[PDB]
Design a protein around this ligand. Structure first.
Ligand SMILES: NC(=O)c1ccc[n+]([C@@H]2O[C@H](COP(=O)([O-])OP(=O)(O)OC[C@H]3O[C@@H](n4cnc5c(N)ncnc54)[C@H](OP(=O)(O)O)[C@@H]3O)[C@@H](O)[C@H]2O)c1
Ligand SMILES: NC(=O)c1ccc[n+]([C@@H]2O[C@H](COP(=O)([O-])OP(=O)(O)OC[C@H]3O[C@@H](n4cnc5c(N)ncnc54)[C@H](OP(=O)(O)O)[C@@H]3O)[C@@H](O)[C@H]2O)c1
Lengths: 330, 330
C-alpha cells in the first residue's frame, strides 16, 4: 500500500507543502509501524521545509518529529507492544504521514486520559525539554532556569518539567499573551524580549545571582544577554539558533568569568541507543506524570494534515503557544 | 615576626618584582601556617603582576598559587597535621613568600622520594589538570584529549594525567623542543601551532573523529581551529584566554553542530569546599602515583626567590617547559 504524507517537492515557503500519496514504509528489524493519528509541528519542520535543516541520515525525508497513533504492524525481533496498541513516538522524521516505522524502544504509551492528538504534542517538545533539563543541563531543585521561547512547544514542556524538578522557571517570549500562558504553566517570571531586556530582568529576579540554567534556542542574538545573566557555574544550554549562530564579542572572557558551560544539545541527530536511553529515562521519570503536579501537553491549534500549509504559515508567524498538532485521516 | 615575600608595588613588567619584608600571616581557624620551601610560577602570576588578574577576595595579594614547605604553626580547630610535617598546598595566593596559611584540607603530603622543590611543581598544575580532565571535562579511557600549551605546567600535568586515565593526549606547543618533551611525557602527538594547523593535524591523527576533550588555555585565537577538530559530544574545556577572549564567527553553529560543550573552568576563584573536594579527590586518586605509571613533576628551572624577576622574565618568554620553581630562603 501507499499512504497520505505531508510533502514538499522543493524547499521554500509553506506554499510548497502539500499532502501526497507516498510509499508506506515497512518495519525493519525491531521496529513497529505506527498508524499515525496525529503528528505535531516542530520548528525543525519549518527549517527542513526551508531546506536549511536536512533530516538525519537514515531518517525519512518526511516532516514530523513525533506521532501518536496505533501500532499497525510489527517488525521482526519485537520485545512488549501489540498490533492495535495506541502509542506515541519520538521520530527523527516521517511523522506527518499516515504511517511511520518506529523502533519499539521509542514508542511510549499514551498517558491514560489523553487523546491521541494531545499525545502528539508530547514526544518532541517533552523529550527535548527533558533532555535539556536533566541529561544535558542537569537541573537541580532550587535552580533558576531561564527558558527562551518559553511558549515554544519545548518552552512549555520545559516550564513544567522545571517545576517538576523543583527548579524555578523564568521564561522569555515576544508576546504579552504568551507570558500569561507561561505564568499559567508555572513560569515564576516572564520577560518580554521585545519590550524589556531579559538579562537585567533575570538578574533582578535572581537578586543578581543569575540563572543556573539557560535553555537557549535563540543563541547569537541573545548571547550577550545570556552570559550576562548566567549564574556562576551556570549551564547555558544551547539547542537552537533562531537568533543566529554568529558571535561577535568576548563570549570566552564572559563565560569563563562566570565559570559557565555552553553545552549544546541536538536530539534529532542522536543514535537509537541515546534516544532509547532518553525515552526509557523519560518513560520511567516523566511520562507517568501526564496522568496523575500533573503534566499538561500544551496544544495551541489542531489542523487536519491537509492544512499542513496553514499550520506552517501559523508557526512561521510565531502565533502558536505550545504545540500545533496535525491530525491524519485514518 | 615579618617574612621575605615576592612583591610588586605597582603592576607592570617583571621589572616591578622584588622581595620584601612583609607581615608573616597568622593561621585563622582551621588552617596551618606553611613555612614555604618552594613555590612555583604560574601564568596567573604574570597576569596578576601585570594587573590583569586581581587575586580572589580573601586570598592574599602576594604571588604564588602553590607552595611546598613545612607545617610551621597550626591554627585553632585542626583535624591530622603536625608542626614540622612537610606538605604542599594549592593556594589562592601567597606562596612566593616564606610563610603562608593554608586550610589543612588543602595541605597535601609531599610524595615519598620527591624534594620539596619538585613538590612545589605539583599543586597548581596538577590539581588544575586533574580538575580539567576529571571533574570538568570528564575524561574517559580512549578519549582523545587535545592539550594546548602542552608544555605549560598544566599541559605537562595533563599529558600525564590523560595517560593515567587511559586517554590519548595530543598536545600543541610553539616549539620543536617542547613537542619533544611532550612526547617524552606521553603525548601521543604534538602539533606546532607556529608551524602547522593543529586542527587539520588533530583530525588527521583522530581519523576525522576529532577530540573528545580540548584543554584550552588559549581560547579566542584558537577557537575556530578548536571547534573544527572537536569530536561529536566533545567537551571543550576553556580555562585560559592567552589567545584572547573575543570570538568573531559561527561558534554557536559550529559548536551546536558538534553537540559540543564549551565548559569553562577556574580553580583560583573556587571556594574551600570545592578545593577540599578536589584536593581530597586528588589526594586519593592521583597523589599516590607520584611515588609508585609514575607521575613526574616537570621542573624546568629553579630560581631562588630573590630572582623572581628573572623567573617571570623567563616565563613571559614562554621558554619554560613545565614548572619554573622558586626556592625560598629558610
Ligand atoms: N536541538 C534539539 O534537541 C531541539 C529539539 C526540538 C526543538 N528545538 C528547537 O527549540 C526551539 C523551539 O522548538 P518548537 O518547535 O517547540 O518551537 P515553536 O513551536 O516554533 O516555538 C518557537 C518560538 O520561538 C520564538 N522565537 C522565534 N524567533 C525568535 C527570536 N529571534 N528571538 C526570540 N524568540 C524567538 C517564537 O515565540 P516568541 O518570540 O513569541 O517567544 C516562536 O513561537 C527551536 O529553536 C527549535 O529549533 C531543538
Ligand atoms: N583557570 C584555571 O583553573 C587555571 C589554573 C592554572 C593555570 N591556568 C592557565 O593555564 C595556562 C597555562 O598555565 P601555566 O602557568 O602552567 O602556564 P606556563 O607555565 O606559563 O605555560 C604556558 C604556555 O602557554 C603557551 N602560549 C602562550 N601564549 C600562547 C598563544 N597565544 N598561543 C598558543 N600558545 C601560547 C606558551 O608555550 P608554547 O607557545 O611554546 O606552547 C607558554 O609557555 C595559562 O593560560 C594559565 O592562565 C588556568
Amino acid at each position: 500500500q501507499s499512504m497520505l504524507a505531508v510533502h514538499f517537492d522543493k524547499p521554500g515557503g509553506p506554499e510548497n507543502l502539500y499532502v501526497k500519496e507516498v510509499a508506506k514504509p515497512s518495519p525493519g528489524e525491531g521496529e513497529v509501524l505506527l498508524k499515525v493519528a496525529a503528528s505535531a509541528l516542530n520548528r525543525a519542520d519549518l527549517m527542513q521545509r526551508q531546506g536549511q535543516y536536512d533530516p538525519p541520515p537514515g531518517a525519512s525525508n518526511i516532516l514530523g518529529l513525533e506521532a501518536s497513533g496505533h501500532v499497525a504492524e510489527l517488525g521482526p525481533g519485537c520485545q512488549h507492544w501489540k498490533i492495535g496498541d495506541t502509542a506515541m513516538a519520538l521520530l527523527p522524521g516521517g511523522g506527518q504521514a499516515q504511517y511511520v516505522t518506529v523502533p519499539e524502544g521509542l514508542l511510549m504509551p499514551i498517558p491514560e486520559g489523553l487523546t491521541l492528538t494531545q499525545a502528539a504534542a508530547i514526544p518532541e517538545a517533552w523529550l527535548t525539554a527533558f533532555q535539556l533539563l536533566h541529561l544535558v543541563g542537569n537541573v537541580q531543585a532550587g535552580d533558576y532556569v531561564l527558558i527562551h521561547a518559553g511558549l515554544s512547544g519545548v518552552g512549555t514542556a520545559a516550564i513544567q518539567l522545571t517545576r517538576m524538578a523543583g527548579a524555578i522557571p523564568l521564561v522569555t517570549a515576544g508576546s504579552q499573551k504568551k507570558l500569561q500562558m507561561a505564568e499559567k504553566l508555572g513560569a515564576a517570571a516572564g520577560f518580554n524580549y521585545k519590550k524589556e531586556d531579559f538579562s537585567e530582568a533575570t538578574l533582578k529576579f535572581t537578586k543578581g545571582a543569575g540563572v543556573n540554567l539557560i535553555l537557549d534556542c535563540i543563541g547569537g542574538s541573545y548571547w550577550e544577554k545570556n552570559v550576562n545573566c548566567l549564574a556562576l557555574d551556570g549551564r547555558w544550554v544551547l539547542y537552537g539558533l533562531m537568533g543566529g549562530g554568529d558571535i561577535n564579542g568576548p563570549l570566552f572572557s564572559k563565560l569563563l568569568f562566570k565559570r559557565g558551560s555552553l553545552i549544546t544539545s541536538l536530539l534529532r541527530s542522536r543514535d537509537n541507543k541515546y534516544k532509547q536511553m532518553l525515552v526509557n529515562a523519560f518513560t520511567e521519570q516523566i511520562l507517568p506524570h501526564f496522568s496523575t503536579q500533573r503534566l499538561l501537553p500544551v496544544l495551541d491549534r489542531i489542523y487536519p494534515v491537509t492544512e499542513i500549509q496553514e499550520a506552517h504559515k501559523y508557526m512561521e508567524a510565531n502565533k502558536n503557544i505550545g504545540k500545533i498538532v496535525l491530525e491524519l485521516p485514518q
